[PDB]
Amino acid sequence: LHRTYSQDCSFKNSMYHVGDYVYVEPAEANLQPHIVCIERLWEDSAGEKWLYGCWFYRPNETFHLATRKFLEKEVFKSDYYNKVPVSKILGKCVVMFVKEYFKLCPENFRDEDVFVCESRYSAKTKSFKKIKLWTMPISSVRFVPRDVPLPVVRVASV
């Protein structure tokens, strides 16, 4: 299965790039699509197009104390990396580092598809840790100053 890697990948009417975030179809009729950062793309010798990257967990996808507070739209950088066929992408989204999320917003994305990341999460130890520096592929999305900054809302889930 010789693979030809690329910085971008076309599928139907869509074009995907390394550094994009995408929603990926889960293995359950009623289950939220997963957020994955595209870190590599390829076409294999069978003609199938694939992405590989890091999974981002929503709060309800973590084991957490009932009292833990979450930002609105918060997601967690997991230690889970896997490949997915490009045919399973349901759409694009954006995850922003906590330091820029409140001041900047991505051009051409609905607010519901923009998430904020402050911490990583490990399923192995069921624990969180604040991220010191944001290390992800450079994305092609364009960020502009928000007209008015978003409020900082941290509340528990339960």
Q: Which residues lie closer than 8 Å to 68 by C-beta, 6 or more apart?
A: 128, 156, 157
Mode of pairing for the β-strands spanning 74-85 and 114-122: parallel
Mode of pairing for the β-strands spanning 114-122 and 34-37: unpaired
- CATH 3.40.50.1370 matches 1-158: no
- Among the listed residues 38, 7, 42, the one whose alpha carbon sits nearest the alpha carbon of residue 23: 38
| Separation of alpha carbons 99 and 152, rounded Å | 12
Technique behind the model: X-ray
User: C-alpha angle 132/133/136, rounded to 5°?
Assistant: 135
3-state secondary structure of 86: helix
Could you tell me the resolution of this structure in angstroms?
1.9
Q: Which residues lie closer than 8 Å to 45 by C-beta, 6 or more apart?
A: 1, 2, 3
What spatial distance separates the first Cα and last Cα of the chain, rounded to whole Å?
A: 46
Cα–Cα separations (whole angstroms), residue 108 to 27, 37, 131, 141, 142:
29, 18, 27, 9, 8
